[PDB]
Each structure stands twice: as C-alpha cells, then as structure tokens.
Amino acid sequence: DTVSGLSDKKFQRPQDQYPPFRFGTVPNGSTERNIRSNYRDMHTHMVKFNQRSVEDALTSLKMGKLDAFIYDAAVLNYMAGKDEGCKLVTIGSGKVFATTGYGIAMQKDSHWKRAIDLALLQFLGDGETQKLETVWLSGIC
Amino acid sequence: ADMIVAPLTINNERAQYIEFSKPFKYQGLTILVKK
Ligand SMILES: *[C@@H]1O[C@H](CO)[C@@H](O[C@@H]2O[C@H](CO)[C@@H](O[C@@H]3O[C@H](CO)[C@@H](O)[C@H](O)[C@@H]3O)[C@H](O)[C@H]2NC(C)=O)[C@H](O)[C@H]1NC(C)=O
Numbered sequence: 001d002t003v004s005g006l007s008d009k010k011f012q013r014p015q016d017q018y019p020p021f022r023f024g025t026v027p028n029g030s031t032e033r034n035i036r037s038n039y040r041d042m043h044t045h046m047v048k049f050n051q052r053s054v055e056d057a058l059t060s061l062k063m064g065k066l067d068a069f070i071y072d073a074a075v076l077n078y079m080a081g082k083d084e085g086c087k088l089v090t091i092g093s094g095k096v097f098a099t100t101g102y103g104i105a106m107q108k109d110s111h112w113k114r115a116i117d118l119a120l121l122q123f124l125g126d127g128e129t130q131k132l133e134t135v136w137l138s139g140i141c
Numbered sequence: 142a143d144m145i146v147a148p149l150t151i152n153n154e155r156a157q158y159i160e161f162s163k164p165f166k167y168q169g170l171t172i173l174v175k176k
Pocket of ligand 1 (some may be wrong): 026
C-alpha cells in the first residue's frame with residue numbers, strides 16, 4: 001500500500017510537491033457530508049472530483065486522471081472483485097472507515113418497523129442472506 | 142436493572158421483549174484451536 005488511510009499527511013496536508021490528488025468522492029451524496037463535517041481541509045482542496053458514478057471514475061483512474069478513489073465499501077469491493085485482472089484497494093480488513101450499514105428508511109414511528117425489523121433479524125439468523133451473497137455478489141479475483 | 146451495558150448479542154429471541162440500540166461493533170463466530 002501507499003497510503004495509511006485518512007490519517008496520512010499526504011491526504012491530511014495537501015501541500016506536497018507531488019500532490020496525490022482527486023480522490024473521487026462523487027459530490028453531494030453521503031461520504032462528502034462526513035468529509036465536510038470532520039476535516040474541512042480536504043473538502044477545500046478536493047475539487048477535481050468526478051461528475052459521474054464509480055463507472056466513470058474507475059475508467060478515469062485506469063486512464064491516469066486520478067490515482068485515488070474514496071467511496072463506499074461494499075460497492076468498491078464489488079467493483080474490485082469484478083474486473084479484468086485486478087485493481088487493488090488498500091488493506092481490506094482495515095479499509096472500512098466510519099463503519100455503518102445499509103437499511104430501510106420509513107416514516108417517523110410507523111408500526112411496520114416492529115415487524116420488518118424482526119423479519120430482517122430472522123433472515124440474518126437462518127442464513128438466507130448468505131446464499132444471496134453467493135448468488136449476487138461474487139467475483140473471480 | 143434498568144440498562145445492560147455489556148457485549149450482548151442481538152438476535153430474534155431477544156428482540157420480542159427488548160428494545161435494542163444500533164450496533165456499536167460488528168462481530169461473527171469463529172473456533173479456537175491450539176497451535
Ligand atoms: C447537489 O446539489 C446541486 C444543487 O442544485 C444539484 O444540482 C446542481 O447545482 C447547480 C448549482 O446550483 C445547478 O446549476 C444550475 O444549472 C442550470 C443549467 O446550467 C442553470 O440554468 C441554473 O441557473 C443553475 O446554475 C444544477 O442544477 C446542478 N449542476 C449542474 C452542473 O447541472 C446536484 O444535482 C446535487 N448533486 C450532485 C451530485 O451534484
């Protein structure tokens with residue numbers, strides 16, 4: 001690896017002669033809020049972003065436009081898993097910063113939450129989420 | 142007791158009688174072998 005995450009001085013201090021620049025961070029989504037809330041200096045420097053989704057960002061990176069991409073964990077892992085050859089993310093076990101999870105958003109205090117949540121717990125309990133992982137999210141590398 | 146602050150596992154059997162909170166650490170299940 002070349003960068004130790006969000007604590008490296010290269011990211012934390014954008015004043016290098018060789019300025020490793022333009023992590024994707026598609027604007028006006030979710031991780032941009034975290035960046036703009038915690039440390040404003042990247043958000044100030046970070047302007048050479050991508051105007052499209054990961055699909056354009058990955059080809060731009062392969063073409064040499066930018067050398068770093070900062071985005072979600074699951075989608076980036078899937079993209080890396082489904083590729084000719086392989087494009088490697090940083091150390092995967094430690095590449096999950098600001099851990100959270102997906103979920104279903106409903107109206108404030110609705111009675112469905114009592115049942116659908118327990119259904120989801122059951123689903124994770126019997127292993128029926130597991131073979132969905134095999135079927136839908138897999139790659140060669 | 143009025144609260145449980147401990148490594149409590151969230152599952153179906155407990156959610157029927159308890160209102161939990163969002164997880165603060167994810168974990169799974171492994172096995173221990175002497176080596
Ligand atoms: C993030 O929020 C912005 C806020 O609207 C979303 O739209 C972008 O914001 C710009 C700046 O307000 C908008 O520019 C507009 O462009 C039209 C056509 O050129 C012009 O007639 C207007 O007066 C205004 O300047 C525009 O709606 C849009 N930006 C572009 C380049 O189209 C944006 O969709 C949200 N999400 C993202 C990922 O940016």
